[PDB]
Amino acid sequence: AQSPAGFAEEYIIESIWNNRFPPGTILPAERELSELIGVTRTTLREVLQRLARDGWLTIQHGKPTKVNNFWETSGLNILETLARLDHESVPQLIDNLLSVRTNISTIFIRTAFRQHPDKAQEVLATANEVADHADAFAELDYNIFRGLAFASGNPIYGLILNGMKGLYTRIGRHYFANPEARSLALGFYHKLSALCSEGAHDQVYETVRRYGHESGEIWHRMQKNLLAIQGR
Amino acid sequence: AQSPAGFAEEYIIESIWNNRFPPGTILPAERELSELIGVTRTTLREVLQRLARDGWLTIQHGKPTKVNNFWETSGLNILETLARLDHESVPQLIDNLLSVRTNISTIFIRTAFRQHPDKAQEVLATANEVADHADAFAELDYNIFRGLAFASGNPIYGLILNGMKGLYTRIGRHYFANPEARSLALGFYHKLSALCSEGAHDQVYETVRRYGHESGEIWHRMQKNL
DNA sequence: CATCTGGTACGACCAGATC
DNA sequence: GATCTGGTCGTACCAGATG
Ligand SMILES: [Au+]
Ligand SMILES: [Cl-]
Ligand SMILES: [Cl-]
Ligand SMILES: [Cl-]
């Protein structure tokens, strides 16, 4: 429920996801929709606007607010809010998101070395004074990839990880719980620190592409115990 | 100038980019800030919300809206309203951008083959009925990668490629102009197309990293003139 | 409570799109 | 122009946070 705005948001959202105001179609006049929902127009706008931004609507002046298939207008800044709608199909998602900061990582981790290998070390060094409990770990892990990202020199790789964070640490606070994983991830970290000094670029794609499978097997073995939109 | 909100926002953002409301700091009360800029609280509110979302502010109830190190809470969705402010360092950025759409593609396109090769086709096919001129060409260029990403099975890459669209097109809309560019691009798409029928995976990272530098040279050789 | 700061509510009006 | 639809305005009031 929440407060008017939150309700109206949470509402309008559901209404899309649930083919009520199916994607690709007009959406009621702000006045009509207002009363329908039970908030005031203004309070509606606020909601309409912030949504518009995420990637749902697409407001224009005289034109009516039209809804959108978000995989066509929306950045990683939705993932989270997506995992919360498609309750059933999430293992799929995270699986994907993982097999991404992975593949991708390799690119910018390599670069992070060639340029700025000095700072690429100021990051992998944090792994010393960290805490040991999952929550504090996740926050570090994600803090490392991101850190490097900017380090590879190309900030875009940052703005990306940046978008990930959300659903990227929720997994963290979870997977990491298993100290067995805190190990592999750590060893992993320090295994690499040494390459900035041992400038062995090559010895990247090798690592990650398995640290991907490795850590993965750990997660898959931590799970084995427990509607609109498309894309194509 | 523009409309209140368009302006009222144009303002709030710029003032962040140029320390008037430095990051980590709090920012004026709605009543006060409103009066200050010239729009109505109402109108302001609209702006502050949409702003929050992109990542700038961080509105909480009682507590005072605080600004943020957007470098920590913002995604590609700003690339646009950045290159627009730092109109000095622009090339470095674009360069970065292309030098990303590059490295990334190699991963997902490759993937787009092993799974869904049949569709990786219906896409590179779009490269026939297109049109010549830059404009419509840019659209295609972007759309192929995007097309490919999705077809790659892992839509997340779509999101990203989706988030770059804005800026990644403004580059297309200028680069492609000089046909010598369109050529390379076509020989490129087409180069791949056949590979979908030749399923020779390993033969991808090669062409991309290349085409990256290549198209690049062409684009770099379009800058040093103005 | 007094008082910051954000959140809502109406209601009259301005402005782009459309045919 | 007549009339959809979104954009702005102002004001009086409600609600969370803090001394
Ligand atoms: Au080093
Ligand atoms: Cl808008
Ligand atoms: Cl959860
Ligand atoms: Cl100015």
PDB file of C-alpha atoms in Angstrom, chain A residues 117-231:
ATOM      1  CA  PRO A 117      47.770  -0.545 -12.775  1.00  0.00           C
ATOM      2  CA  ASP A 118      48.985   1.612  -9.902  1.00  0.00           C
ATOM      3  CA  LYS A 119      45.476   2.398  -8.783  1.00  0.00           C
ATOM      4  CA  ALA A 120      44.248  -1.013  -9.831  1.00  0.00           C
ATOM      5  CA  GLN A 121      46.202  -1.968  -6.775  1.00  0.00           C
ATOM      6  CA  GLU A 122      44.743   0.612  -4.433  1.00  0.00           C
ATOM      7  CA  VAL A 123      41.475  -1.241  -4.968  1.00  0.00           C
ATOM      8  CA  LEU A 124      42.388  -4.917  -4.629  1.00  0.00           C
ATOM      9  CA  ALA A 125      44.103  -3.787  -1.391  1.00  0.00           C
ATOM     10  CA  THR A 126      40.842  -2.987   0.364  1.00  0.00           C
ATOM     11  CA  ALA A 127      40.396  -6.739   0.551  1.00  0.00           C
ATOM     12  CA  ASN A 128      42.619  -6.619   3.619  1.00  0.00           C
ATOM     13  CA  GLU A 129      40.738  -4.527   6.229  1.00  0.00           C
ATOM     14  CA  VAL A 130      37.258  -5.750   5.260  1.00  0.00           C
ATOM     15  CA  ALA A 131      34.877  -7.516   7.611  1.00  0.00           C
ATOM     16  CA  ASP A 132      34.232 -11.270   7.325  1.00  0.00           C
ATOM     17  CA  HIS A 133      30.421 -11.490   7.409  1.00  0.00           C
ATOM     18  CA  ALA A 134      28.487 -11.854   4.135  1.00  0.00           C
ATOM     19  CA  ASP A 135      26.835  -8.404   4.124  1.00  0.00           C
ATOM     20  CA  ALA A 136      30.135  -6.672   4.575  1.00  0.00           C
ATOM     21  CA  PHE A 137      31.637  -8.934   1.918  1.00  0.00           C
ATOM     22  CA  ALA A 138      29.062  -8.360  -0.765  1.00  0.00           C
ATOM     23  CA  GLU A 139      29.513  -4.643  -0.268  1.00  0.00           C
ATOM     24  CA  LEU A 140      33.236  -5.127  -0.870  1.00  0.00           C
ATOM     25  CA  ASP A 141      33.062  -7.487  -3.789  1.00  0.00           C
ATOM     26  CA  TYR A 142      30.724  -5.200  -5.745  1.00  0.00           C
ATOM     27  CA  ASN A 143      32.947  -2.460  -4.504  1.00  0.00           C
ATOM     28  CA  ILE A 144      35.894  -4.055  -6.203  1.00  0.00           C
ATOM     29  CA  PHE A 145      34.541  -4.663  -9.648  1.00  0.00           C
ATOM     30  CA  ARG A 146      33.151  -1.138  -9.661  1.00  0.00           C
ATOM     31  CA  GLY A 147      36.413   0.258  -8.343  1.00  0.00           C
ATOM     32  CA  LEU A 148      38.374  -1.457 -11.138  1.00  0.00           C
ATOM     33  CA  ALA A 149      35.786  -0.433 -13.649  1.00  0.00           C
ATOM     34  CA  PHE A 150      36.565   3.188 -13.169  1.00  0.00           C
ATOM     35  CA  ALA A 151      40.182   2.026 -13.041  1.00  0.00           C
ATOM     36  CA  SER A 152      40.146   0.473 -16.502  1.00  0.00           C
ATOM     37  CA  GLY A 153      40.016   4.155 -17.262  1.00  0.00           C
ATOM     38  CA  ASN A 154      36.748   4.050 -19.137  1.00  0.00           C
ATOM     39  CA  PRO A 155      34.070   5.445 -16.760  1.00  0.00           C
ATOM     40  CA  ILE A 156      31.285   3.922 -18.820  1.00  0.00           C
ATOM     41  CA  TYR A 157      32.115   0.521 -17.365  1.00  0.00           C
ATOM     42  CA  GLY A 158      31.410   2.305 -14.122  1.00  0.00           C
ATOM     43  CA  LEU A 159      28.087   3.786 -14.950  1.00  0.00           C
ATOM     44  CA  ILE A 160      27.224   0.174 -15.858  1.00  0.00           C
ATOM     45  CA  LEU A 161      28.229  -1.634 -12.695  1.00  0.00           C
ATOM     46  CA  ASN A 162      26.691   1.323 -11.022  1.00  0.00           C
ATOM     47  CA  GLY A 163      23.306   0.318 -12.509  1.00  0.00           C
ATOM     48  CA  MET A 164      23.903  -3.242 -11.469  1.00  0.00           C
ATOM     49  CA  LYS A 165      24.601  -2.669  -7.759  1.00  0.00           C
ATOM     50  CA  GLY A 166      21.015  -3.165  -6.579  1.00  0.00           C
ATOM     51  CA  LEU A 167      20.189  -6.647  -7.721  1.00  0.00           C
ATOM     52  CA  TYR A 168      23.948  -7.297  -7.763  1.00  0.00           C
ATOM     53  CA  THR A 169      24.478  -7.088  -4.035  1.00  0.00           C
ATOM     54  CA  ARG A 170      21.155  -8.643  -3.047  1.00  0.00           C
ATOM     55  CA  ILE A 171      22.649 -11.788  -4.510  1.00  0.00           C
ATOM     56  CA  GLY A 172      25.838 -11.005  -2.713  1.00  0.00           C
ATOM     57  CA  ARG A 173      24.375 -10.659   0.737  1.00  0.00           C
ATOM     58  CA  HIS A 174      22.990 -14.091  -0.118  1.00  0.00           C
ATOM     59  CA  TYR A 175      25.508 -16.264  -1.990  1.00  0.00           C
ATOM     60  CA  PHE A 176      28.447 -15.011   0.072  1.00  0.00           C
ATOM     61  CA  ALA A 177      26.766 -16.178   3.286  1.00  0.00           C
ATOM     62  CA  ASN A 178      28.552 -19.441   2.479  1.00  0.00           C
ATOM     63  CA  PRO A 179      32.121 -18.821   3.763  1.00  0.00           C
ATOM     64  CA  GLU A 180      33.191 -21.399   1.168  1.00  0.00           C
ATOM     65  CA  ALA A 181      32.452 -18.699  -1.399  1.00  0.00           C
ATOM     66  CA  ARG A 182      34.081 -15.922   0.579  1.00  0.00           C
ATOM     67  CA  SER A 183      37.182 -17.982   0.040  1.00  0.00           C
ATOM     68  CA  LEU A 184      37.151 -18.395  -3.730  1.00  0.00           C
ATOM     69  CA  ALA A 185      36.213 -14.715  -4.142  1.00  0.00           C
ATOM     70  CA  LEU A 186      39.031 -13.625  -1.897  1.00  0.00           C
ATOM     71  CA  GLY A 187      41.662 -15.898  -3.355  1.00  0.00           C
ATOM     72  CA  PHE A 188      40.327 -14.617  -6.625  1.00  0.00           C
ATOM     73  CA  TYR A 189      40.889 -10.995  -5.623  1.00  0.00           C
ATOM     74  CA  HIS A 190      44.469 -11.483  -4.417  1.00  0.00           C
ATOM     75  CA  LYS A 191      45.243 -13.857  -7.277  1.00  0.00           C
ATOM     76  CA  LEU A 192      44.706 -10.798  -9.488  1.00  0.00           C
ATOM     77  CA  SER A 193      46.338  -8.127  -7.322  1.00  0.00           C
ATOM     78  CA  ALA A 194      49.571  -9.891  -8.171  1.00  0.00           C
ATOM     79  CA  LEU A 195      49.066  -9.455 -11.925  1.00  0.00           C
ATOM     80  CA  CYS A 196      49.161  -5.723 -11.806  1.00  0.00           C
ATOM     81  CA  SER A 197      52.644  -6.192 -10.546  1.00  0.00           C
ATOM     82  CA  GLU A 198      53.011  -9.270 -12.779  1.00  0.00           C
ATOM     83  CA  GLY A 199      51.482  -7.459 -15.786  1.00  0.00           C
ATOM     84  CA  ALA A 200      50.268 -10.728 -17.284  1.00  0.00           C
ATOM     85  CA  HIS A 201      47.125  -9.391 -18.921  1.00  0.00           C
ATOM     86  CA  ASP A 202      46.368 -12.641 -20.765  1.00  0.00           C
ATOM     87  CA  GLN A 203      45.874 -14.222 -17.367  1.00  0.00           C
ATOM     88  CA  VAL A 204      42.453 -12.631 -17.075  1.00  0.00           C
ATOM     89  CA  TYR A 205      39.838 -14.093 -19.386  1.00  0.00           C
ATOM     90  CA  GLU A 206      41.249 -17.400 -18.170  1.00  0.00           C
ATOM     91  CA  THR A 207      40.454 -16.703 -14.551  1.00  0.00           C
ATOM     92  CA  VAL A 208      37.086 -14.945 -14.605  1.00  0.00           C
ATOM     93  CA  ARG A 209      35.548 -17.250 -17.229  1.00  0.00           C
ATOM     94  CA  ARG A 210      35.998 -19.995 -14.670  1.00  0.00           C
ATOM     95  CA  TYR A 211      35.559 -17.936 -11.525  1.00  0.00           C
ATOM     96  CA  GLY A 212      32.253 -17.454 -13.271  1.00  0.00           C
ATOM     97  CA  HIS A 213      31.597 -21.168 -13.444  1.00  0.00           C
ATOM     98  CA  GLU A 214      33.341 -21.806 -10.154  1.00  0.00           C
ATOM     99  CA  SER A 215      31.469 -19.303  -7.985  1.00  0.00           C
ATOM    100  CA  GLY A 216      28.447 -20.225 -10.058  1.00  0.00           C
ATOM    101  CA  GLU A 217      28.502 -23.886  -9.079  1.00  0.00           C
ATOM    102  CA  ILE A 218      28.608 -22.586  -5.504  1.00  0.00           C
ATOM    103  CA  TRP A 219      25.458 -20.573  -6.008  1.00  0.00           C
ATOM    104  CA  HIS A 220      23.587 -23.248  -7.985  1.00  0.00           C
ATOM    105  CA  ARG A 221      24.404 -25.455  -5.033  1.00  0.00           C
ATOM    106  CA  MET A 222      22.990 -22.863  -2.647  1.00  0.00           C
ATOM    107  CA  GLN A 223      19.671 -22.759  -4.435  1.00  0.00           C
ATOM    108  CA  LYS A 224      19.158 -26.516  -4.740  1.00  0.00           C
ATOM    109  CA  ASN A 225      17.307 -26.480  -1.399  1.00  0.00           C
ATOM    110  CA  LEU A 226      14.298 -24.241  -2.088  1.00  0.00           C
ATOM    111  CA  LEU A 227       2.330 -11.128 -17.197  1.00  0.00           C
ATOM    112  CA  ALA A 228       3.407  -8.399 -19.639  1.00  0.00           C
ATOM    113  CA  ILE A 229       6.656  -7.467 -21.438  1.00  0.00           C
ATOM    114  CA  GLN A 230       8.970  -9.236 -23.903  1.00  0.00           C
ATOM    115  CA  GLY A 231      12.171  -8.309 -25.676  1.00  0.00           C
TER     116      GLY A 231
END
